[PDB]
Amino acid sequence: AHRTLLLRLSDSGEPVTSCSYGQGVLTLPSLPLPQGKKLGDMPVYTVKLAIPAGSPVTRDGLIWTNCPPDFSTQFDREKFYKKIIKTSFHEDDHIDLDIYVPGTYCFYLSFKNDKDELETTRKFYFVVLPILSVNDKFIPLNSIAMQSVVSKWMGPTIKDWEKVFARVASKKYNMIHFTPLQHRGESNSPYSIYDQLEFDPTVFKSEKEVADMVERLRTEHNILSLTDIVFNHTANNSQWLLDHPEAGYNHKTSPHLISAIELDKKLLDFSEQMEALGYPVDLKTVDDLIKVMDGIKEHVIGELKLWEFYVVDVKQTVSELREKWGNSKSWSDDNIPSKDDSTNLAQFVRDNATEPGFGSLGERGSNKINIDKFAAILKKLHSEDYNNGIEELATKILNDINLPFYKEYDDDINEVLEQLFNRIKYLRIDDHGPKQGPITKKLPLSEPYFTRFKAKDGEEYALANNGWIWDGNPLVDFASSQSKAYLRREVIVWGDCVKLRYGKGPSDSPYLWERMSKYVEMNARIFNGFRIDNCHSTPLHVGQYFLDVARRVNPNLYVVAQLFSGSEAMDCLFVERLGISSLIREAMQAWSEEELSRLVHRHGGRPIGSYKFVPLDDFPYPADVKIDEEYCAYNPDDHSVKCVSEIMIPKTLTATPPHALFMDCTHDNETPNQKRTVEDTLPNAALVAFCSSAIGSVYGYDEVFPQLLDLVQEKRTYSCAENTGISKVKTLLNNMREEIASEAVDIEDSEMHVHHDGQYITFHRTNAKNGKGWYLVARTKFHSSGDQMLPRIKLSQTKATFKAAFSLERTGDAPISDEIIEGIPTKLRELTGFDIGFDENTKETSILLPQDFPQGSIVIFETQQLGIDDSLDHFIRSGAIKATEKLSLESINYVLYRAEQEEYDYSEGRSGAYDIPDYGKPVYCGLQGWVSILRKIIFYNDLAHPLSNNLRNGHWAVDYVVNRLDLYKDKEGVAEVQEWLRSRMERIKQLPSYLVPSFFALVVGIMYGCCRLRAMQLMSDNVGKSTVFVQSLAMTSIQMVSAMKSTSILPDQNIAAMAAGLPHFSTNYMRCWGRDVFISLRGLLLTTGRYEEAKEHILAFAKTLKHGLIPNLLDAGRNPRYNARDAAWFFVQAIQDYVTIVPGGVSLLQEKVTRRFPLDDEYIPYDDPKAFSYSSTIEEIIYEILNRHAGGIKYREANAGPNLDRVMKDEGFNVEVNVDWETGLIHGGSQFNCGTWMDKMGESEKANSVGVPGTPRDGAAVEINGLLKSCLRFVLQLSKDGKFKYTEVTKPDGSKISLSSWNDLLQENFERCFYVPKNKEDDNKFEIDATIINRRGIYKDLYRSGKPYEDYQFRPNFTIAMVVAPELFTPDYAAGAIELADQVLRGPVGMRTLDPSDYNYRPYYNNGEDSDDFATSKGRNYHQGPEWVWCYGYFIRAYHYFNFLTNPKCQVEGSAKKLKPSSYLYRKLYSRLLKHREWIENSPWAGLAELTNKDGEVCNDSSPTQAWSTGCLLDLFYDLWISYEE
Ligand SMILES: OC[C@H]1O[C@H](O[C@H]2[C@H](O)[C@@H](O)[C@@H](O[C@H]3[C@H](O)[C@@H](O)[C@@H](O[C@H]4[C@H](O)[C@@H](O)[C@@H](O[C@H]5[C@H](O)[C@@H](O)[C@@H](O)O[C@@H]5CO)O[C@@H]4CO)O[C@@H]3CO)O[C@@H]2CO)[C@H](O)[C@@H](O)[C@@H]1O
Ligand SMILES: OC[C@H]1O[C@H](O[C@H]2[C@H](O)[C@@H](O)[C@@H](O[C@H]3[C@H](O)[C@@H](O)[C@@H](O[C@H]4[C@H](O)[C@@H](O)[C@@H](O[C@H]5[C@H](O)[C@@H](O)[C@@H](O)O[C@@H]5CO)O[C@@H]4CO)O[C@@H]3CO)O[C@@H]2CO)[C@H](O)[C@@H](O)[C@@H]1O
Ligand SMILES: OC[C@H]1O[C@H](O[C@H]2[C@H](O)[C@@H](O)[C@@H](O[C@H]3[C@H](O)[C@@H](O)[C@@H](O[C@H]4[C@H](O)[C@@H](O)[C@@H](O)O[C@@H]4CO)O[C@@H]3CO)O[C@@H]2CO)[C@H](O)[C@@H](O)[C@@H]1O
Ligand SMILES: OC[C@H]1O[C@H](O[C@H]2[C@H](O)[C@@H](O)[C@@H](O[C@H]3[C@H](O)[C@@H](O)[C@@H](O)O[C@@H]3CO)O[C@@H]2CO)[C@H](O)[C@@H](O)[C@@H]1O
């Protein structure tokens, strides 16, 4: 059953995090395998990659990964495997990587540049954890309890070990970590290994004997077993080092050390003969150690000769100049700085006349001049004859060259001295650690830094032995030639053990890499896992290759690291690549009480009432995605990784931080006896145990041992003394955690609260699904620090239960035995007097501690939050699908959207939108409003948000959500949605205040997704199966199309009517504009499948016609206004678009409507007998337009004067349109008029612009005539098929033209009248004036308008003509124009309404301005540089069409040897839509704006969601879809 999760990639192929859980790693769920299935029967998991559509990374895209294809193909980390990415511009690709076996896995993408070179992404790793299991018992990785045992304090039979096993076993540890149990070195450290291939002889003969022992623990005590593995060193005494001295760092491999080796041999040479000189045998004073210090300087620094290791031997160089003088002739070049530049020159000699390896460390005297090249320089520079003070001048240069080399040697040797001051004064004088043993064979001053021996190959050698460095970047091998640590004495040295030089790979040390392979394999097949000692100082590549080896031998290997690299950032990288399962943490490192309350809070779990992830509005809802109809898919034995909802988007795969294994105390930790008090052994151990994480403990901690046990010098066995110290209490803690084990799986599940108060720590450990808590009061004994009274503890809507209490008390001191290691004497006495008090009216629990509660104590309560059971979880995640089942694309508006005024309109003034205290109102009353706010909130777990606050401050939002819908209750399927939301909301309100933010988020998020999946399902497939960006655009339809009370499109009914934009054009006499509806209709209604709707709109506006054209503003068709020339044509174009797209849509034409105005252009009878009086087929309405225009229109706007328009001058009101029969084109309007969409009628007083419009667009508007062309074309093509029945047009004289002629008329005259050619000579043919011009290569915005130059302005309107009727345009001419637009008119999200070069380019729309600026005052600007967004939609459609005809490299050989666009062109289209993708992600409303200000700046007056802004971008998608997608 279902075991997939979904890893969204970005545009750059980077993974996408679903939640901020902070610096993490992509680890997959630690579940067991589904019931029955063994490893390799099936994918363990499957990571779905989801690549976004049209992203750069999909251009010759490819996904490379090293997950093997099948269960048989071994993993090799280097072998990759290809997967082709399917490009769509609409449709995101998805690629499944099946994982068959656990480990670590990367993938990258290869793809093609915009240089057409081949680029790679980084690698992106992800981990699959082992299934730890003991019998038929799955051990989740948070129920590990690991007891570190040291092999050599368990006594000499495997029998006496089985007792130590029994004792841990009874405290219910399930994992034992052994420190290595191999043949030990000479020092007898378990970390100093004599032979990694053989197990300790004292105990085991064979490996069988150890594997069988470990297999006892498994069956005998239910215990899994780790080993320490040691990668960085073997022991001084190993006699494979005789046989392979190359494995370490010596004269041959690491030659830089040659200086450091000589220093070391000449320091144990000293302590020998130091006896015969000065008085430093044994000392106790800083001013008779300074006596040894100068004794050093003389006999060892001095005796290795001013350090020929750094510096040039000037005396040698010079006298070999005198002998080889006269040999490299001269130096011919000009490259020598004059002798005056003492420095510049010496730097020149360094570069040009030195032997390779200059400025190195290595050999005794290996920093050499090229004598002969030097001579040359000197000859050229000074004199050919040596005897003109060359000997001199050569020494000067040579010395200047040695100046940084000598300061290098001095910096180095001061740091040698100070390092030897501070480790003879630590090793031989008490500071923190006295150890005053004077000199020996085996106790000199200098720690042996190198191990010294004659090899089997006969030669002497000296391998560097390993250590650590106080404040060093740990990732930088200090034995490498990068660092001088062995020479500078910066190493803290385990003379015990020898450092192992792995290489770049096995080539550099091949014998080594084989032993370590033989070693790692051997342990891997015995043990369930490893503990990697000192991981951060083991080069990644080494760690990776050897863990891979093991994990080949044992797929379910468990790996635990001691790892502090520099950053969390790094520790993630190591975990990533090595497949580390667990990072180790130490409680004993906490200095104070607070330092511990903090550690505990890192490894606690998430806040109480933390937000829960849902997919919201940044996902694609495939119309065809699975549904889990009442959340019943997941079957408990199948171990299915579950989706959040009914709708089956998978569980996202996000970075979570690496898994922690918290040690109450490690085997390198000073004991609570030492660092605090034995009494703290309890509360410290409980605190840790109460974390949500694995835990462990060293043997003896629970047993209350006194001193940390020295790994080397210790001799004895562990006591057989059963049930000592804390045993009873771990048994309880471990058995308790086991009960919890089953339940909490994922990071979101176990929440918590931690509180430090003085010496008390308080740890609430909740489960977030079901409400079970555990509460712990731990009173620490950091010190014996007196009497403190913790205050009345208060829980909310919670119940409490005493579970246990204890106090650890010191009975006296530790016994003292030569051959047995024992505990401190300790009582563990049970406690009482804890007063639990539940207030039946607050529902508050108060907890009072008795005064008998000595530091060193615990009380555990079990808790249970009130209002949560197992039941809740499911009920919240179900039936949201069946609620929405009755929704329409109208009714979805009501549930989701509804701008505030849209909601005052339904509620006659009293309802509106919810004011969140200290935030303000959301934007839609409906769910979108909330989702827009919640999303960032869920992402950041912001429980501080004003919404988060108000949501527990009370339940008012909860109820607002369910009560809004009273208004829209009768609308289809809203009722049922509301009732889903009431039931879930009702139930939520039975929760503790503090859980209501979390659950309200989820309850909304769920119904929002259901609601949105329901939208894609009812819309067309082209929308249904596309990208987010597109659905997002598509939904904007559902914002705009809803029914009202104050308005409609039919006048007797109120139905679904399309608004121009929210919230400025949504209500009363202002929602519908003929212009806006019909520019939108294709995008929002047709592209999307809402054909039935489109029809209702077309027919509803049809009714309105008069003056042979269609009205601007439509009062649901009753007293509309005809100040609009634009409209009729945009209308007719939609009629075409409909007949084209709708199946059998031709039949629209025969559809009758009530004409609700008479056939002459008679005055307004609103509701006479003369309204529903006579009818009209859409057929004879199209005709009606063409014919009326043909024969001239002329009219004084019905009902003129201040009333119908407050600003229109008297002159303007009466309007004209007349067809110039010389060209066939429509001229009209006047200089006091705005028939076009660029219709600001200037209003300001102080700037003097009243009744004087800013963009009259009289005469031949470009769009209008392009639209006329389209219309003629279409009706002709229709005449041809019986559907239109007209060729008829009477002209204002009486004469009659074939519609077919009119078509042929424009077809020749249009481009002529409108084009402005690039070449000044072609002007003849194209009708113009040179001095009244701006640019060229334009198609002008107007022909013969009221003012000369307003024709010749570059403006984004011609693009409309180019889309609707491209036959008018000679390809190459248009492609040049549309390309200038792209560099000049195209803003980042909208199209500049005027050429920036122009004198009256003022690109900031400020509709408030009361100024004396004729341009800017009261928004005259609107259409003069402001960047409109529907304009981009025409621009981009057009830009694609003509780059696909015109340009060769925009095309390619498609399906069926016919042409389709190339990746190159899509790339350019995609790029010009990124700022729209982003705009819509980050609008608080779904959509794109009306209108932007100069270069993308947000225009505060712009309606922030416009209808046509997205309708026109939907068009483009539909083109690419219909045009090329089969
Ligand atoms: O110049 C370098 C160094 O030398 C001199 O300091 C000496 C110290 O004063 C001396 O005590 C000795 O350190 C002891 C130490 O007393 C003892 O506690 C234990 O060391 C602890 C460290 O105290 C502790 O910080 C921790 O170290 C971490 C380290 O912080 C972490 O970043 C990472 O690198 O891992 C380290 C541990 O692996 O744990 C260690 C024990 O593991 O043992 C030490 C050795 O006996 O060290 C110096 C003499 O050798 C200079 O005076 C001083 O400027 C510098 O500290
Ligand atoms: O009872 C019916 C109704 O009749 C009369 O209405 C008339 C208007 O009062 C009258 O001014 C005229 O309207 C024209 C207007 O002159 C013209 O400028 C244009 O309107 C533009 C705005 O100028 C423009 O700024 C923009 O306004 C947005 C603004 O960007 C936004 O920030 C926010 O403030 O909202 C505004 C929209 O509400 O866009 C509009 C329209 O696109 O076009 C108008 C008509 O074409 O003609 C009206 C005809 O009915 C009465 O005066 C009125 O009181 C009565 O209710
Ligand atoms: O051959 C006899 C040698 O005697 C001397 O060496 C001593 C050192 O001076 C001590 O410092 C000590 O080193 C221990 C170390 O104290 C202990 O913590 C442990 O460290 C592990 C550690 O647990 C692990 O996390 C990782 O860091 O690896 C370490 C293993 O190195 O073990 C250290 C080594 O035993 O003991 C040594 C050995 O007695 C003297 O300096 C030598 O020159 C001399 O040869
Ligand atoms: O001061 C306002 C100014 O506006 C009107 O002139 C217009 C020009 O006709 C128009 O072409 C444009 O001028 C550009 C030139 O044509 C072009 O050759 C090049 O030189 O750049 C000019 C930059 O504007 O500018 C204005 C419209 O904004 C009006 O007719 C003038 O009388 C009036 O003085």
Numbering used by the authors: 3 to 1528
Sentences reproduced from the published study:
GDE possesses the α-1,4 glucanotransferase (GT) and α-1,6 glucosidase (GC) activities, and removes glycogen phosphorylase-digested branches in two steps56. Its GT activity transfers a maltotriosyl group from the branch to a neighbouring non-reducing end, and forms an α-1,4 glycosidic bond between them. The last residue on the branch is subsequently removed by its GC activity. The structures revealed that CgGDE is composed of four domains, and adopts an elongated structure.
